[PDB]
Amino acid sequence: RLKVKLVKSPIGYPKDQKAALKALGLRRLQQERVLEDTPAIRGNVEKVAHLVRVEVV
RNA sequence: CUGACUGGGGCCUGUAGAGCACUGAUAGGGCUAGGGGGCCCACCAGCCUACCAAACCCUGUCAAACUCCGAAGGGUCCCAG
Ligand SMILES: [K+]
Ligand SMILES: [K+]
Ligand SMILES: [K+]
Ligand SMILES: [Mg+2]
Ligand SMILES: [Mg+2]
Ligand SMILES: [Mg+2]
Ligand SMILES: [Mg+2]
Ligand SMILES: [Mg+2]
Ligand SMILES: [Mg+2]
Ligand SMILES: [Mg+2]
Ligand SMILES: [Mg+2]
Ligand SMILES: [Mg+2]
Ligand SMILES: [Mg+2]
Ligand SMILES: [Mg+2]
Numbered sequence A: 001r002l003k004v005k006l007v008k009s010p011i012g013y014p015k016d017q018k019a020a021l022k023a024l025g026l027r028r029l030q031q032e033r034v035l036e037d038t039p040a041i042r043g044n045v046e047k048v049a050h051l052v053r054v055e056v057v
Numbered sequence B: 001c002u003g004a005c006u007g008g009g010g011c012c013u014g015u016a017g018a019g020c021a022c023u024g025a026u027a028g029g030g031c032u033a034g035g036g037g038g039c040c041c042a043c044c045a046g047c048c049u050a051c052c053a054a055a056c057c058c059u060g061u062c063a064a065a066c067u068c069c070g071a072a073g074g075g076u077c078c079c080a081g
């Protein structure tokens, strides 16, 4: 499982990166979600790597 | 539950780059159809050129409307989140 925390604001970033955060359920700064490590989920995690911090739990 | 976005799979494309196979452009040399003069000689032709220049050969380049090539990506469909 992956633990993903939103640490940088998506203001000013392209709409596809905003949509990737919505697909992951990250809506607030510093919000923390535990998601399953599957390629479909992981693909969106990589897309917004510069905005989030990822840990394995 | 079909959405943005994402994962896998197939198909579509001629840009970036690159290249000279086509079309044009183009540097140096070699070889020479044909040019300027020329030893001339019109009875008849070769030859002389550190003056041009067709093709050809070597070396060396350029291109939005060149392409023997050709990505990253993008588009679309199917299945999955
Ligand atoms: K669904
Ligand atoms: K050419
Ligand atoms: K595809
Ligand atoms: Mg920011
Ligand atoms: Mg905004
Ligand atoms: Mg920004
Ligand atoms: Mg900003
Ligand atoms: Mg916030
Ligand atoms: Mg180019
Ligand atoms: Mg090429
Ligand atoms: Mg040119
Ligand atoms: Mg030449
Ligand atoms: Mg070129
Ligand atoms: Mg160019």
Ligand SMILES: [Mg+2]
Residues within 6 Å of the ligand: none
């Ligand atoms: Mg070129």
Ligand SMILES: [Mg+2]
Residues within 6 Å of the ligand: none
């Ligand atoms: Mg053309």
Ligand SMILES: [Mg+2]
Residues within 6 Å of the ligand: none
């Ligand atoms: Mg081209």
Ligand SMILES: [Mg+2]
Residues within 6 Å of the ligand: none
């Ligand atoms: Mg579905």
